[PDB]
């Protein structure tokens, strides 16, 4: 059975898919603020689920997870969501964590909870890392400025208006993916509005973790990010000791999105490079 | 686990979450075309949830069941989808169907092929119990005219012009009902594009199943429905033999986003009367 569900600390039932080979290394997806784990494209997950055990997580308050009240300021939560997902899949090492967006905040929850005793490596894609006044791992850009807050809002009339102060940003050039450009505006409407307003309404820094992690991080991040903005990614690369990077000249926010055959690729050879064939050749 | 899947006759995956007391009268709840399980809204599922063992379902193609390429004009897959859910939660006797627009047709193929030994009662909402050129049963809206073909573009400026004039009649209001506004409308858009149109192109006829139907059933309907016409279910409560029916006045495609308290009470009540 593919779907199934975890309960984290503070009672919350949290939605995730699980493909691919039981046998292989463990790839949790984390998305982006007012996602789900539909957006990575049928493709980027077919390819994945080959060599991974892969586990499409849908973040509290988004996709088929419960919506509490609140709590969506609180790292303990969002840490206990991915401790409790790992436990569910009996997972206590080698994960690979990849974020996109917001899900890199979620992985430096967790690491900042847990440590990376049941973690290999992690993939910052588009990622923030810290959230306030401050924060160059929170660093957002022009596009995400305009589109909130009437992004959170009720009123669909606004909501609409500001979602598509996005553009194209999550597509990139649109043409051949109308598709996936309509189901990724989708999975932002269908976001609660109050959970798209709680998560940004909140603070935390996690610079100290970053400079500390002892695994290896592929930050891989669009030069034209108008969401994320490249700085952030360029900040994570920088602390982070065992930092590899990948910027993706004129790509914008969804690098999965514009080229699935070059974001699977990279993703395969990161992991990959984690054992010791590197040093064989 | 709330969450669950079950394997229908070709191989596809249906989703479905379960809620409720195993005990109770299991409910199946059968969305409409391009929308998914959270459709009906958290009081009207909270409410229903209080009573019943309920049974929300993604239908194929639709919120995270599987997309299979093909078969969408097939009553036989539709219906193994049903059996398959009812099979997977050993639900053998006194089931309630629930259908909300193309959820009716869904019902239909389903005690087509395996008749009511399954089922105590249905409900169609809003629904279509047939499809295609001359269908009494299958009458669409002003509203479901307008948004063909642009609904099935692949192209965003298409789709989301014609999916959001769409999604108005779902509502009804919108005021008072902006985060529903935006989900319905945002399930439809997330749903595949080539699935909004496979399910439209078909044709099936289920008269002669509806006027043999050995169960009761309630026509649950908005008079000013502009997605599928009150003259589909006046058609329906008319050859079915034990039919009930009540029809909301002034009321649209989504009588449950409308007056969730009304649809869960009259809901209840037929189900409760099942004696």
């Known amino acids: 059975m593919s779907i199934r569900e975890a309960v984290s600390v503070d009672g919350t039932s949290i939605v995730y898919r699980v493909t691919g080979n039981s046998a292989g290394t463990p790839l949790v997806l984390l998305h982006g603020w007012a996602q789900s784990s539909q957006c990575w494209g049928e493709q980027v997950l077919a390819d994945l689920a ?16 419960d919506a509490p009240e609140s709590g969506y300021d609180d790292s303990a939560n969002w840490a206990g969501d991915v401790a409790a997902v790992l436990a569910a899949e009996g997972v206590t090492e080698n994960a690979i964590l990849l974020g996109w967006s917001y899900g ?13 005793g049941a973690v290999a490596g992690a ?3 588009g990622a923030i ?17 305009s589109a909130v807050p009437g992004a959170m809002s009720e009123d669909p009339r606004e909501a609409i208006r500001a979602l598509g102060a996005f553009g194209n940003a999550l597509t990139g050039p649109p043409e051949g993916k109308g598709a996936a450009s309509q189901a990724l505006f989708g999975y932002s409407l269908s976001t609660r509005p109050r959970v798209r307003a709680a998560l940004f309404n909140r603070a ?21 990010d108008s969401v994320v903005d490249v700085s952030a ?12 990077a990948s910027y993706w000249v004129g790509c914008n926010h969804g690098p999965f999105v514009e080229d699935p055959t070059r974001f699977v690729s990279e993703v395969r050879t990161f992991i990959s490079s984690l054992g010791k064939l590197a040093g064989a050749a």
């Not at 890392?129 to 400025?145: F, Q, W």
């Not at 935390?204 to 034209?224: A, F, K, S, W």
């Not at 990614?233 to 590899?244: R, T, V």
């Open 123 to 125: 993939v910052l894609v």
């Open 50 to 65: 080959a060599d991974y055990r892969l586990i499409a997580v849908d973040l509290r308050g988004h996709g088929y997870s």
């Open 204 to 224: 935390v820094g996690h610079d100290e973790l970053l400079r500390n992690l002892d695994i290896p991080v592929l930050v891989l991040h669009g030069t034209d």
């Open 233 to 244: 990614g360029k900040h994570a690369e920088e602390l982070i000791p065992k930092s590899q």
């Open 104 to 116: 890199g905040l979620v992985i430096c929850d967790y690491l900042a909870a847990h440590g990376t």
């Open 129 to 145: 890392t810290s959230i306030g006044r401050g924060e160059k791992g929170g660093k957002v850009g022009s596009a995400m400025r």
